[PDB]
Amino acid sequence: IPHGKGGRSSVSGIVATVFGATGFLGRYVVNHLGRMGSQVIVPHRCEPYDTMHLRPMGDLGQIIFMDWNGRDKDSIRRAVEHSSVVINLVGREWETQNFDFEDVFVKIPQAIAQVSKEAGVEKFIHISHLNADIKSSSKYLRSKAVGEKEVRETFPEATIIKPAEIFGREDRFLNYFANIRWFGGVPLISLGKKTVKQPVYIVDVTKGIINAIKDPDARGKTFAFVGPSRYLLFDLVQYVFAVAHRIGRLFEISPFEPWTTRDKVERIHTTDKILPHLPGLEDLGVEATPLELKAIEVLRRHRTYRWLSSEIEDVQPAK
Amino acid sequence: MNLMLALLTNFTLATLLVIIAFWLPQLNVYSEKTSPYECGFDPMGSARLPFSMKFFLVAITFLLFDLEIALLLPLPWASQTANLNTMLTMALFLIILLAVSLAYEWTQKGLE
Numbered sequence: 329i330p331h332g333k334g335g336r337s338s339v340s341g342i343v344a345t346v347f348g349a350t351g352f353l354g355r356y357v358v359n360h361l362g363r364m365g366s367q368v369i370v371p372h373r374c375e376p377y378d379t380m381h382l383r384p385m386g387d388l389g390q391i392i393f394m395d396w397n398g399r400d401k402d403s404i405r406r407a408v409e410h411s412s413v414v415i416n417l418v419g420r421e422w423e424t425q426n427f428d429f430e431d432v433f434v435k436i437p438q439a440i441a442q443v444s445k446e447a448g449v450e451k452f453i454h455i456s457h458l459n460a461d462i463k464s465s466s467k468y469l470r471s472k473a474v475g476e477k478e479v480r481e482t483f484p485e486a487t488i489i490k491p492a493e494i495f496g497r498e499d500r501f502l503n504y505f506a507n508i509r510w511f512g513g514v515p516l517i518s519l520g521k522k523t524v525k526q527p528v529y530i531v532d533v534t535k536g537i538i539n540a541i542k543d544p545d546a547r548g549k550t551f552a553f554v555g556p557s558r559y560l561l562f563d564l565v566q567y568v569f570a571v572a573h574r575i576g577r578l579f580e581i582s583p584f585e586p587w588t589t590r591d592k593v594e595r596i597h598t599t600d601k602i603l604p605h606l607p608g609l610e611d612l613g614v615e616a617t618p619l620e621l622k623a624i625e626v627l628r629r630h631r632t633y634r635w636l637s638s639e640i641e642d643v644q645p646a647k
Numbered sequence: 648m649n650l651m652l653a654l655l656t657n658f659t660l661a662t663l664l665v666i667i668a669f670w671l672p673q674l675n676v677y678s679e680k681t682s683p684y685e686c687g688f689d690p691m692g693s694a695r696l697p698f699s700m701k702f703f704l705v706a707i708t709f710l711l712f713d714l715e716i717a718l719l720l721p722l723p724w725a726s727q728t729a730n731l732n733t734m735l736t737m738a739l740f741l742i743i744l745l746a747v748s749l750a751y752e753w754t755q756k757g758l759e
């Protein structure tokens with residue numbers, strides 16, 4: 329039962345759990361539950377010290393850590409037994425040399441869609457992506473739209489989420505560009521046609537969850553996440569060079585965490601804007617955020633001072 | 648022919664060792680945030696380097712005392728001669744031409 333005011337050292341009655349919640353997204357959600365009060369049980373896989381930069385997030389005795397593997401059907405059953413809502417961000421990019429990647433969107437999201445359903449969680453949640461379509465594409469982008477089919481079977485109440493290409497602070501989406509000091513910028517694939525997607529700013533997505541986290545009355549009913557206006561141009565790859573003015577790694581260095589001459593190059597140009605009829609955002613709102621204004625912050629390079637940026641974009645068309 | 652073998656040997660250990668220190672963890676997978684937090688403990692510091700003179704003269708002031716102690720250098724080869732008086736009478740001139748050039752300026756060093 330909620331008490332007092334939402335500042336910190338308060339209650340607000342919801343427990344949670346957030347699986348994953350180390351890399352870019354999960355760190356940035358829990359930080360919004362280390363404020364309005366919670367009990368956020370964040371487990372994590374292998375990382376003893378990479379989770380510390382998190383701890384000054386909940387006040388005291390709020391967030392609490394466990395250890396788990398995730399192919400053991402017990403490790404997901406020992407935590408969740410006491411919970412209210414449980415969201416799931418788990419999963420990643422490239423196929424691991426260990427995890428074969430095929431069912432880690434299939435077996436894992438179900439492996440935690442095991443006793444969670446049984447044990448009496450509620451308002452269980454999962455992630456989708458705006459561009460994943462069960463027609464043939466894309467080797468990584470596929471197996472994600474299987475969860476929308478395969479996993480939705482279990483837990484008839486989900487409110488599974490479908491956002492766009494997101495740009496954060498430390499994010500890897502818009503940062504693959506501008507790391508491209510290289511033989512030259514070569515768009516994908518050397519064509520200025522279908523860029524770009526709906527680049528929503530990471531706050532609005534992470535403010536969506538906690539707006540549905542007790543919504544009420546969204547369960548089973550899936551939503552998708554609007555971008556800003558409107559579609560976008562090729563200039564986005566020029567815009568990068570317009571302003572830029574041209575966990576558990578190792579001790580020394582790794583062996584392979586590449587640019588992946590594979591799905592990576594073709595996952596970024598898959599575009600496929602999709603069904604509007606999903607509610608999907610202002611209903612869960614109220615949030616929408618632009619690009620032109622919020623892309624200076626995340627981009628700071630070797631001038632570090634000059635900006636003087638006047639150049640904008642129409643939409644662009646198909647708009 | 649073995650000198651250059653003893654020089655490019657030396658640099659190539661040094662010009663190696665930069666990369667195996669600077670570069671090797673430089674591509675490591677740690678965080679390394681781009682935030683403008685660097686340039687320690689004088690956070691911003693926006694100015695030109697102003698001209699500050701008594702910094703300057705201590706350049707010039709040396710450069711001239713420098714020259715003649717190249718002129719002064721071939722004494723110990725010149726101590727072997729025929730008529731030597733043209734040495735002692737002459738050798739001792741440069742020095743006193745050096746030491747004079749002090750005494751004048753010595754009225755004003757300022758804070759050196």
Ligand SMILES: NC(=O)c1ccc[n+]([C@@H]2O[C@H](COP(=O)([O-])OP(=O)(O)OC[C@H]3O[C@@H](n4cnc5c(N)ncnc54)[C@H](OP(=O)(O)O)[C@@H]3O)[C@@H](O)[C@H]2O)c1
Pocket residue numbers: 348349350351352353354373374375397398417418419420421432436455456457491492493494575576
């Ligand atoms: N919504 C979007 O815009 C978007 C964009 C790209 C990708 N995604 C997908 O949506 C989620 C966003 O992930 P992210 O942005 O935070 O990047 P991320 O690097 O994939 O973060 C995932 C974290 O969980 C770990 N992990 C990987 N597989 C795991 C597993 N089976 N079980 C437990 N932990 C696992 C990863 O390594 P450790 O195991 O060492 O912790 C990493 O620490 C991911 O599922 C991602 O594949 C979403």
